[PDB]
């Protein structure tokens, strides 16, 4: 057997994982046979928490559950209707665990847009028809917090399109206080934001197509404005009018267009708000304190921490999340070194002169994320080990002495495991390790004093037994030296790769700002089929613009998208040719989204290196894409700023060079993110230039092209295109 296309599509080979939910410092929940069990890590015993019969009172309509912090109630989510990437609506009913009954009084309404328990206890806040509502007790009536909500105009406690996708990476815009006195929330106003409109054809029985419309700021368009409010939840009554307190954003940021980009409660009387100018080389973290007597939140200038960049933008995508100490006096966050390397800096509540902080890590490698912060130690993930930017390991550092820097995951299994993710318990007493590659993913439980593996949660032995008759590809993670700098690649090689042979090459590209497509993770995907069955080498290259390797590399494409990142992808191909095992007459490239852009730019470059390629839902020019993402890298499309490079970096300008290649263009018609327009303009420019190419639209599909049948169809279509191109 080879790993066929049918195997990839039908999903015959399941890469298992293990998702648990740490409820306490020693206990986590897990799904058995649709049953939810509680596992205590101090012991080795399990306890039934929620039987599958309870979910079956709603049939198969259940989509998720959410247990209250105090474990007295369970939110049961059903009738899930997807919206954008993170947003959806659902129905909810609360289940009393103690009494084993549903609360049928003052129930959560239909089409709820977001809902969450408080941090402690069991208070609820939810959004419905763009307004926020609060329940102190599951059986109690809701307190209407806001009355300005309006479909696609005013959002209370939920993000609008661009804030969901590009800033928060979630639909939620509300944040409960630690002990639940205060609920904070953002409010967005889309008035003036121009609308993207497209057709949705729906099922065959719909006689007239309906026009979908979304407020969606394209590059240099009017953006949504924002406000931030904090309501007192313990003082809510039907007899008194509910009045939220407004926090004004830092003066240095409200001089023009700006964003809210991070919120974190420090204490019950303290909250950190990060803001960001529309020109995204300037951010401000304001620590704001509650005044007991005058009912206002104060944001003193002394508690404003500035971030900036002279070479690019702030943070990888957004300015980094602060992690505060339990007293709320100091906080840690990831920030660029003097050498451009992203590392954990330590700050105080007050800013020091010239905004200085203490770096507790350093070197030619980056901290990826901060996972836990206890009294004594800091847990983080980095790519330090073996100087591999696409490796991930758990580290443990002491706040007193920065030299005491353990690696907890480096050695465990160095052949099978170079790419770890972690899930630490409520106060870091235990932790789940998630080995994601390059071997078969491995999930294990650990105690934190001694790094003692308690048990194996998932070893993927079932997948092991099923792969034993299949010709397995291998993954090669390595680098090449260009101008004294090393750039990593990865190659999914055909089974028993014979370097003496010449193989066809497929560049699989994304190559967006801060992207990493060369890593030590394990994937059972389309590329494996191409190697296993078609004997095609699938390669990815992290050139300039790629992340996790310092700001010198990442900011190289500042104001210049469609430049060095596309050129570097061509050069990688040339380097693969010099390695002697690539058939130069059969080199191709494909990508999705930014990958689609880079693919099209590569093919239109006239390099002569690539026979063919496939662009899936490509960006075609940056004026068509949303403000927040685009302007972060390209600035505004004006004569005063970067309009010349906006006009110069389009796929359409390169139409004539596509005569040298075979091109497949694919786009979902209901793509809310990278709009069909973008491919519509590419095809119109190609047609105008007399260039042949091949095309495929997917009716009603969005950016994921993720409906099962469409998903199978696109990969079949693309597969056939490579067969034609290579055979």
């Amino acid at each position, epitope marked *: 057997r080879t790993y066929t296309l049918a195997d990839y599509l039908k999903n015959t080979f399941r890469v298992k994982s293990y998702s648990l939910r740490w409820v306490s410092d020693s206990e986590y929940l897990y799904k058995q046979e649709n049953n939810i069990l509680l596992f205590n890590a101090e012991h080795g015993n399990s306890s039934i928490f929620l039987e599958n019969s309870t979910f*079956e009172i709603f049939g*198969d309509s259940i989509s998720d559950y959410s247990v209250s912090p105090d474990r007295l109630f369970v939110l049961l989510e059903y009738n899930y209707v997807k919206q954008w990437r993170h947003s959806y609506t659902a129905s909810y009913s609360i*289940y009393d665990l103690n009494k084993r009954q*549903l609360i*049928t009084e003052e129930k959560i309404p239909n089409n709820t847009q977001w809902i969450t328990w408080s941090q402690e206890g069991h208070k609820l806040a939810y959004v419905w028809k763009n307004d926020i509502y609060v329940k102190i007790e599951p059986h109690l009536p809701s307190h209407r917090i806001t009355s300005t909500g309006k479909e696609n105009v005013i959002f209370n406690g939920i993000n609008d399109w661009v804030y969901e996708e590009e800033i928060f990476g979630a639909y939620s815009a509300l944040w409960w206080s630690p002990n639940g006195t205060f609920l904070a929330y953002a409010q967005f106003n889309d008035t003036g934001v121009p609308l993207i409109e497209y057709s949705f054809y729906s099922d065959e029985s719909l006689q007239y197509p309906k026009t979908v419309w979304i407020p969606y700021p394209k590059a240099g368009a009017v953006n949504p404005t924002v406000k931030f409010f904090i309501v007192n939840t313990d003082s809510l009554s039907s007899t008194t009018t509910t009045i939220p307190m407004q926090i004004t954003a830092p003066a240095s940021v409200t001089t023009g267009d700006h964003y809210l980009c991070d919120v974190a409660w420090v204490s019950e009387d303290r909250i950190s708000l990060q803001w960001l100018r529309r020109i995204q080389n300037y951010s401000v973290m304001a620590i704001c304190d509650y005044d007991k007597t005058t009912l206002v939140w104060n944001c003193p200038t002394t508690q404003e921490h500035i971030e900036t960049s002279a070479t690019g933008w702030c943070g990888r995508f957004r300015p980094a999340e602060p992690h505060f100490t339990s007293d709320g006096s100091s906080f840690y966050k990831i920030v660029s070194d003097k050498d451009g390397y992203k590392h954990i800096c330590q700050f105080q509540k007050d800013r020091k002169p010239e905004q200085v902080c203490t770096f507790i890590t350093k070197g030619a490698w980056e901290v990826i994320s901060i996972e836990a912060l206890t009294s004594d130690y800091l847990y983080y993930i980095s790519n330090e080990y073996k100087e591999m930017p696409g490796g991930r390991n758990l580290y443990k550092i002491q706040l007193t002495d920065h030299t005491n820097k353990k690696c907890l995951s480096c050695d465990l299994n160095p052949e099978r495991c170079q790419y770890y993710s972690v899930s630490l318990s409520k106060e870091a007493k235990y932790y789940q390790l998630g080995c994601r590659g390059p071997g078969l993913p491995l999930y294990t439980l650990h105690r934190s004093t001694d790094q003692k593996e308690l048990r194996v949660l998932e070893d993927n032995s079932a997948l092991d037994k099923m792969l034993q008759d299949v010709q397995m590809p291998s993954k090669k993670l390595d680098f090449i030296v260009l101008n004294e700098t090393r750039f990593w690649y990865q190659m999914i090689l055909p089974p028993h790769f014979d370097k003496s042979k010449k193989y066809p090459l497929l560049i699989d590209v994304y190559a967006g700002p801060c992207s990493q497509k060369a890593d030590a993770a394990f994937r059972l995907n389309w590329a494996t089929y191409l190697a296993s069955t078609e004997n095609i080498i699938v390669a990815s290259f992290d050139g300039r613009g790629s992340g996790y390797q310092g700001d010198k590399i990442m900011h190289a494409i500042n104001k210049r998208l469609g430049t060095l990142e596309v050129e570097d992808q061509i050069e990688a191909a040339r380097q693969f040719l010099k390695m002697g095992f690539v058939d130069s007459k059969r080199v191709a490239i494909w990508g999705w989204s930014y990958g689609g852009y880079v693919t099209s730019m590569v093919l239109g470059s006239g390099s002569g290196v690539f026979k063919c390629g496939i662009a899936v839902a490509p960006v075609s020019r940056w004026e068509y894409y949303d403000s927040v993402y685009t302007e972060r890298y390209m600035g505004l499309p004006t004569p005063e700023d970067n309009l010349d490079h906006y006009r110069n970096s389009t796929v359409m300008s390169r139409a004539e060079n596509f005569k040298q290649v075979e091109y497949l263009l694919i786009h979902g018609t209901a793509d809310d993110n990278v709009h069909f327009q973008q491919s519509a303009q590419i095809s119109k420019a190609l047609v105008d230039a007399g260039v042949d190419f091949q095309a495929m639209w997917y009716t009603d599909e969005d950016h994921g092209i993720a409906s099962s049948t469409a998903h199978q169809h696109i990969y079949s279509h693309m597969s056939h295109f490579l067969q034609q191109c290579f055979s």
Partner: antibody, heavy 117, light 107 residues
Framework: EFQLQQSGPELVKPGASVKISCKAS????????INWMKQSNGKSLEWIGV????????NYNQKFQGKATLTVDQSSSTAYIQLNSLTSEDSAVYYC??????????WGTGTTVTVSS | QIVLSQSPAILSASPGEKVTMTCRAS?????MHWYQQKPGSSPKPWLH???NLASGVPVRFSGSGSGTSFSLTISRVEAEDAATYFC?????????FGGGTKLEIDR
């Protein structure tokens, strides 16, 4: 190995109420959910609600929130449906059905209930 | 409450023939179920999980479909098949029934 027998037919005046039984035997009664349906003569079927025998947890169709009241005896392996404050439009057949974590895999004889003066 | 529609009301096909059946929803559904009921008798479980055959169910039957149009196919129709088939949905609460496909036999 899966028997669902319900009590016999029923006549009642408008305003009154009635309880109908559903005896279960052969299997471990405490493991699967009892769901109740309604079928007016000629019309389509309608779901009323469900109970989990083990803990007595119920879930009603909003349409019958006030109308039906479901209960369970686990020593007798019997489930009941109390239909309260009846009228002419409550006249129909009523089925107790099992749920095997997927669908209704056992159906009882069906109790014809008539409401008239 | 997703409203299901049974296509058609009464399907009259002879013994040994092709007989296909289809349930049509107002909104998408992940799995479809099917139940056989004869006049003066209770419904019976036939096909669960779109297409799987219940315990003791004949093998001349098969199911299929996805989204807003599922289906069920009876192969060589026998005399005993004469009944009424109902489609059940419960991927969306509350569960619903499609108002009957009456299997008539043409002889």
């Amino acid at each position: 190995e899966f028997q669902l027998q319900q009590s016999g037919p029923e006549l009642v005046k408008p305003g009154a109420s009635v309880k109908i039984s559903c005896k279960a035997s052969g299997y471990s009664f405490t493991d699967y959910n009892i769901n109740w349906m309604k079928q007016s003569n000629g019309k389509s079927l309608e779901w009323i609600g469900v109970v989990i025998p083990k803990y007595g947890t119920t879930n009603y169709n909003q349409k019958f929130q006030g109308k039906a009241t479901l209960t369970v005896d686990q020593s007798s392996s019997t489930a009941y449906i109390q239909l309260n404050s009846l009228t002419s439009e409550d006249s129909a057949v009523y089925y107790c059905t099992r749920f095997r974590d997927v669908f209704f895999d056992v159906w009882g004889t069906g109790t014809t209930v008539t409401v008239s003066s | 409450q997703i409203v299901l529609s049974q296509s058609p009301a009464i399907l009259s096909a002879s013994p040994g023939e092709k007989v296909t059946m289809t349930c049509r929803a107002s909104s998408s559904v992940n799995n479809m179920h099917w139940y056989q009921q004869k006049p003066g008798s209770s419904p019976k479980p036939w096909l669960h999980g779109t297409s799987n055959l219940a315990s003791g169910v004949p093998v001349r039957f098969s199911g299929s479909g996805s989204g807003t149009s599922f289906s069920l196919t009876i192969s060589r129709v026998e005399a005993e098949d004469a009944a009424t088939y109902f489609c059940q949905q419960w991927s969306n609460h509350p569960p619903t029934f499609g108002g009957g496909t009456k299997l008539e036999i043409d002889r």
